[PDB]
Design a protein around this ligand. Structure first.
Ligand SMILES: Nc1nc2c(ncn2[C@@H]2O[C@H](COP(=O)(O)OP(=O)(O)OP(=O)(O)O)[C@@H](O)[C@H]2O)c(=O)[nH]1
Ligand SMILES: Nc1ncnc2c1ncn2[C@@H]1O[C@H](COP(=O)(O)OP(=O)(O)CP(=O)(O)O)[C@@H](O)[C@H]1O
Ligand SMILES: Nc1nc2c(ncn2[C@@H]2O[C@H](COP(=O)(O)OP(=O)(O)O)[C@@H](O)[C@H]2O)c(=O)[nH]1
Ligand SMILES: COc1ccc2c(c1)NC(=O)CN2c1nc(Cl)nc2ccsc12
Ligand SMILES: [Ca+2]
Ligand SMILES: [Mg+2]
Ligand SMILES: [Mg+2]
Lengths: 298, 427, 437, 53
């Protein structure tokens, strides 16, 4: 009858995961500050990795990968994608420049005039990064509209990368080369992979698999394999998994571009119970005892 | 590192005498004081409780005290009645009449320096005197009153040694006199101020344990003291036998008491055995673990789940996989992690000894400093006011020269003790 | 040639010092009566082993050791043991009553009364050494004498031998084998006081050594006797450079300038491999790239931490056995690629290497197998602070309630030394963090 | 990768590899020791005072 604590009350996702765990009749919750836990649904920043995996006769698991921040911080992602040789100087990341406060359209916040950019960041005081705006993106008809793709990606304790096969798009109900209808028909301003694949078929003569998801899988696989040695917990004294949200942009002729990696993602409402289930089957009980995932083999 | 043992009054001296029979058999010392022993684990630390004697005899470092002669007479007529140093039967003739004031203030005073002088003789011929371990009951007059007086005097002469007592809480289920809650509260007031550690051996619990668990219909003091020596032999295990711990009273005091007043322990024993009948399957380490922490194996009338464990000592006697004990003891804490305070980390330390007690191939003693013990003092302190708010039976004491105000301090101090035990049950 | 004095304090120190001296005597061929047939310089010599041994006119090789314990229990087993003749009687010192797991008891109460005796016993060894380098101090954080007396002694050496180096082998407390509930108290008080008086201190977290014993030695419930024999194995390669002819780490002061660039951050991380069992028959012999690689697996370190999430400041590699610099370099080059080896910029990203050909020595009938080649990596990585975090937390949970403080104040200590000592620790954790991000 | 300082010996060798370059006196002691023994002799003498009452 495994035990678990809860230390991130704002987590949209693990809310469900903590819920379900109790209702299995075999998981119990202790208070925040009890050390005797098998599972840590941890806080977002300063999650105390240095203190885990130390309680004798207690296998401990946490829902964060130490060092994942390399892939999920705007300034820090470009560092990874440009320095580490596995991510070459790569054909699916928008050109980025990091900058410290102390056709040529760009975004941080967007304009073709450079100095609009520099004045913008230095008048804030923190470090941002600027990146070519996708001038010719794929406008979903009818509407000549902009959208983005977020696939959620779950990484288990033994670094199996599982792609959630439910995706979602955020749409932008009239793109023009003039914060209006450029930064993200379908209820919720959200379209789901079945409908988009359907539209993909009738408008373009293609499908979601061949035209988008191939390269999304080539990205989601390429990024998590790069940082795999820095964050692996294969021989560690505690163990980690982490649900991720990769944010993708598909340009005019079906080119998938990775944009953000959100390491504390919230899931679309439609899929919550489904997604939060596979989390428990895949990343929780696979330690403490068809599939809705695509194992991305490496 | 010699301990010095004192037993006071009828109760002190009956259970006291059992402890010396029980540990003498474990250490292989017969009623003549000779060692016919198998292993030398029996002899490595025999000097803690026994003075080595001429012709290589072993004598208990034990002083017998009482105000009525006669209990010690029976002792001097029991099997291990001759093992005791004859001089160490310090006693008077008046009796103390189940009255705290008589034994503490008037009767006890007449004869107290005489016990102190014996104590002194024993302190010389100590290499490193640890401290004193006293047995006594809290609801009479000689053990409760003369005992608490004697404790107070030893702390004055030996201010820097450990003071350890085995006190028998009074319960109406095995009772002598309606005045018992007066003596217990007056004694608990002393016990708070001048002992480092006292094992609350509750007669209510001993009673119920016999009645229900041991399924005994009419339990005697004979049957209560069997449980008492089994517990007492269990708790002394690490002081008497060699092992990884090499435990001593001052260490036990340090690790067991987070706060000086909260130094009253709930002892446990498992398996609960009934005098005479042995049952022939020895427990399995998982069996001892559950029973020892179960309220039904507690020698105090508090169920531990109404409080939290400040700290815990566990001692397993027998031949068993310490790997398995390590696991089973880990399991109990992790399975019930809420009932141990978080703010004293890893507060359940375990010890293990090859030598088991007599009869049992596998036994487990339990020592817990739980916030539940306030339950016991709540019980005593209600029985108390039931009478005091009517000043019932106070003449028996007021006559001996005591004041109403003295009772109000004792009651007031004791109720503060329950308040303090409550504070850490919420932290 | 320059002599060193080892000092073993409390049960932990004494029992690990026994563990070492036994292994030293096997390594140097000195039998338990102190006769060393190989020594032709009978009664003297400026030889390498004379760093740890002095010779008698009778040709005895005598440890430059001193064992102190506030109870006569442990040093008595030394006094009657297989190596009794090794140590002259004045080297072994016992009290009558230990510090009862109380830093304040061993430091202030019982410590003011034996401190003068010990320092004269120590002064004796110095008067027989032609140039004293410094002291190798063995103790445990959790003990009362382990912690209280050591830090009273560390202060006095800094006064009576100020111009000498003071190295430390400390047993960081962990609860499988812990015997006391206040060890986090004893730990912070003793660290706060010693920090200024020690030049380099190697922490052996007992939790680590225990799992190494269970897993790689197939030892169900490892004993102290299991732990210490593994520890001195680590302790031997770490000090082998002083006892043996060599070119890297030839005196105590070089330890300070190889491993410790800033003074307060002087806790190098030891990682040793291969710990192969004596029972296991038909064992594949591990290559220089295999064992050197193992130095970077967390499950071979003495403190469980993740150097990937830290910065390096220094790194030595001490091989022992059949090892040639060629193989060392190939292994390093390829290990550089496959691992997360991050130094601080103000430090070079290099590896100081030593090779001693005398292959590892193992006690006959011990648990460690005999191996052809061994390595011990000593790395000052900022990730060792994980240990100071965990320790400091346990300290905060209890102290917040003041649990057990009365046992300390009653010895004369004031609640203030607790917060003042924790303040230091909080400062130390911040140094580690500023240097590591 | 550059080697340096390589020394040799019948016992073994040593060397260094670089992957890349950079970018209370005895009186004050006895005093605080005494302050602690006084605080004990007080607390004790105060214990003996309350006993005498
Ligand atoms: N590795 C190892 N650790 C030990 C050994 N002996 C004791 N320890 C550790 O030391 C801690 C307690 O400190 P001790 O050294 O035993 O106590 P002490 O130094 O004798 O000081 P006192 O409190 O007076 O007894 C325990 O938590 C043990 O983990 C040993 O032989 N080997
Ligand atoms: N290089 C680029 N070209 C075109 N559009 C871009 C772009 N980079 C970002 N965008 C668009 O502009 C938006 C800017 O938002 P940004 O990427 O900063 O938010 P985010 O993804 O961090 C929000 P969340 O954390 O909720 O997912 C993106 O969501 C995307 O729609
Ligand atoms: N468990 C146990 N309790 C006893 C025994 N004898 C007396 N008591 C308890 O002690 C109380 C009587 O006090 P007692 O010790 O006889 O008076 P004293 O002669 O002045 O010490 C009663 O309430 C009993 O419950 C005994 O042999 N065993
Ligand atoms: C709660 O944590 C604890 C508790 C109790 C002790 C310690 C730590 N450590 C010690 O050295 C002495 N002591 C003990 N003494 C005796 Cl007689 N029996 C036992 C049995 C188990 S522990 C113990
Ligand atoms: Ca010589
Ligand atoms: Mg009676
Ligand atoms: Mg000791």
């Amino acid at each position: 009858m495994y035990t678990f604590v809860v230390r991130d009350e704002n987590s949209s996702v693990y809310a469900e995961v903590s819920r379900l765990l109790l209702a299995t009749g075999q998981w119990k919750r202790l208070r925040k500050d009890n050390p005797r836990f098998n599972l840590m649904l941890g806080e977002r920043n300063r999650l105390p990795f240095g203190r885990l995996g130390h309680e004798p006769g207690l296998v401990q698991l946490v829902n964060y990968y130490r060092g994942a921040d390399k892939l999920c911080r705007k300034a820090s992602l470009v560092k990874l994608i440009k320095t580490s040789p596995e991510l070459s100087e790569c054909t699916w990341f928008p050109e980025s420049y990091v900058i410290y406060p102390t056709g040529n359209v760009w975004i941080a916040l967007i304009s073709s005039e450079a100095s609009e950019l520099l004045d913008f960041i230095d008048e804030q005081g923190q470090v941002h990064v600027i990146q070519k705006y996708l001038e010719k993106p794929l406008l979903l008809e009818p509407g000549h509209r902009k959208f983005d793709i977020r696939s959620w990606v779950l990484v288990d304790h033994l670094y199996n990368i599982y792609l959630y096969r439910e995706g979602v798009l955020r749409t932008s109900s009239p793109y023009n080369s003039a914060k209006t209808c450029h930064l993200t028909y379908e209820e919720g301003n959200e379209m789901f992979f079945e409908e988009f694949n359907q539209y993909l078929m009738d408008a373009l003569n293609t499908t979601l698999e061949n035209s988008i998801l191939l390269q999304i899988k080539h990205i989601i696989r390429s990024c998590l394999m790069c940082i795999e040695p820095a964050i692996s917990t294969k021989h560690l004294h505690y163990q980690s998994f982490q649900l991720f949200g990769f944010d993708f942009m598909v340009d005019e002729e079906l080119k998938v571009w990775l944009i953000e990696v959100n390491g504390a993602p919230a899931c679309a409402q439609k899929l919550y119970a489904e997604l939060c289930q596979g989390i428990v089957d895949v990343a929780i009980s696979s330690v403490f005892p068809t599939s809705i995932f695509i194992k991305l083999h490496h | 590192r010699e301990i010095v043992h004192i037993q006071a009054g009828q109760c002190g001296n009956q259970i006291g005498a059992k402890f010396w029979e029980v540990i003498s058999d474990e250490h292989g010392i017969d009623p003549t004081g000779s060692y016919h022993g198998d292993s030398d684990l029996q002899l490595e630390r025999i000097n803690v409780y026994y003075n080595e004697a001429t012709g290589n005899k072993y004598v208990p470092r034990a002083i017998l005290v009482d105000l009525e002669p006669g209990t010690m007479d029976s002792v001097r007529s029991g099997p291990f009645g001759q093992i005791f140093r004859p001089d160490n039967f310090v006693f008077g003739q008046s009796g103390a009449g189940n009255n705290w004031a008589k034994g503490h203030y008037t009767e006890g005073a007449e004869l107290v320096d005489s016990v102190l002088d014996v104590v002194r003789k024993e302190s010389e011929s100590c290499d490193c005197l640890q401290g004193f371990q006293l047995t006594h009951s809290l609801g009479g007059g000689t053990g409760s009153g003369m005992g608490t007086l004697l404790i107070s005097k030893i702390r004055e002469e030996y201010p820097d040694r450990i003071m350890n007592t085995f006190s028998v809480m009074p319960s109406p289920k095995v009772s002598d006199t309606v005045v018992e809650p007066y003596n217990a509260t007056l004694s608990v007031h002393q016990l708070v101020e001048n002992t480092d550690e006292t094992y609350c051996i509750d007669n209510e619990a001993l009673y119920d344990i016999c009645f229900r668990t041991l399924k005994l219909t009419t339990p005697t003091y004979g049957d209560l003291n069997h449980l008492v020596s089994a517990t007492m032999s269990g708790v002394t295990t690490c002081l008497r036998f060699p092992g990884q711990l090499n435990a001593d009273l001052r260490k036990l005091a340090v690790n067991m008491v987070p706060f000086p007043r909260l130094h009253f322990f709930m002892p446990g024993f498992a398996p609960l055995t009934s005098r005479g009948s042995q049952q022939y399957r020895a427990l399995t380490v998982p069996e001892l673990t559950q029973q020892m922490f179960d309220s039904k194996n507690m020698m105090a009338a508090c169920d531990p789940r109404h409080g939290r464990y400040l700290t815990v000592a566990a001692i397993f006697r027998g031949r068993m996989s310490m790997k398995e004990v390590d696991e089973q003891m880990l399991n109990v804490q992790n399975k019930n992690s809420s009932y141990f305070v978080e703010w004293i980390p890893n507060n359940v330390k375990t010890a293990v000894c090859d030598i088991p007690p007599r009869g049992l191939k596998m036994s487990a003693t339990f020592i817990g400093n739980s916030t539940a013990i306030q339950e016991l003092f709540k019980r005593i302190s209600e029985q108390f006011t039931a009478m005091f708010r009517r000043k019932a039976f106070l003449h028996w004491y007021t006559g001996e020269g005591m004041d109403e105000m003295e009772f109000t301090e004792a009651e007031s101090n004791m109720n503060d003790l329950v308040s303090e035990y409550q504070q850490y049950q919420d932290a | 040639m320059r002599e060193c004095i080892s000092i073993h304090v409390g049960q932990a120190g004494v029992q690990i010092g026994n563990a070492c001296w036994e292994l030293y005597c096997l390594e140097h061929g000195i039998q338990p009566d102190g006769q060393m047939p190989s020594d032709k310089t009978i009664g003297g010599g400026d030889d390498s082993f004379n760093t740890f041994f002095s010779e008698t006119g009778a040709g005895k090789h005598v440890p430059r050791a001193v064992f102190v314990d506030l109870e006569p229990t442990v040093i008595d087993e030394v006094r009657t043991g297989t190596y009794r003749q090794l140590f002259h009687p004045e080297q072994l010192i016992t009290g009558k009553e230990d510090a009862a797991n109380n830093y304040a008891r061993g430091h202030y109460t019982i410590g003011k009364e034996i401190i003068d005796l010990v320092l004269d016993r120590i002064r004796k060894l110095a008067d027989q050494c032609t140039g004293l380098q410094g002291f190798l101090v063995f103790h445990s954080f959790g003990g009362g004498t382990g912690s209280g007396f050591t830090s009273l002694l560390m202060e006095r050496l800094s006064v009576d031998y100020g111009k000498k180096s003071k190295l430390e082998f400390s047993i960081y407390p962990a609860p499988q084998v812990s015997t006391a509930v206040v060890e986090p108290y004893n730990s912070i008080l003793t660290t706060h006081t010693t920090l200024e008086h020690s030049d380099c201190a190697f922490m052996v977290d007992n939790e680590a050594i225990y799992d190494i014993c269970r897993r790689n030695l197939d030892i169900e419930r490892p004993t102290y006797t299991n732990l210490n024999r593994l520890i001195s194995q680590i302790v031997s390669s770490i000090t082998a450079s002083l006892r043996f002819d060599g070119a890297l780490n030839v005196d105590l002061t070089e330890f300070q300038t190889n491993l410790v660039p800033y003074p307060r951050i002087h806790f190098p991380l030891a990682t040793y491999a291969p710990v192969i069992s004596a029972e296991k028959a038909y064992h594949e012999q591990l290559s220089v790239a295999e064992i050197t690689n193992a130095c970077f697996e967390p499950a071979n370190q003495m403190v469980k931490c993740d150097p990937r999430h830290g910065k390096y400041m220094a790194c030595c590699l001490l091989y022992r056995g059949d090892v040639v610099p060629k193989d060392v370099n190939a292994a390093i080059a390829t290990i550089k690629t496959k691992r997360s080896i991050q130094f601080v910029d103000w430090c070079p990203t290099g590896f100081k290497v030593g090779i001693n050909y005398q292959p590892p020595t193992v006690v006959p009938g011990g648990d460690l197998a005999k191996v052809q080649r061994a390595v011990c990596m000593l790395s000052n990585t900022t990730a060792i602070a994980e240990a100071w975090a965990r320790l400091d937390h346990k300290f905060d949970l209890m102290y917040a309630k003041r649990a057990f403080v009365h046992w300390y104040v009653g010895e004369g200590m004031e609640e203030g030394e607790f917060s003042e000592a924790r303040e230091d620790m909080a400062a130390l954790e911040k140094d580690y963090e500023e240097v590591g991000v | 990768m550059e080697v340096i300082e390589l020394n040799k010996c019948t016992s073994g060798q040593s060397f260094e590899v670089i992957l890349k370059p950079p970018s209370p006196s005895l009186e004050e002691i006895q005093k605080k020791l005494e302050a602690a023994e006084e605080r004990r002799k007080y607390q004790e003498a105060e214990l003996l005072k309350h006993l005498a009452e």
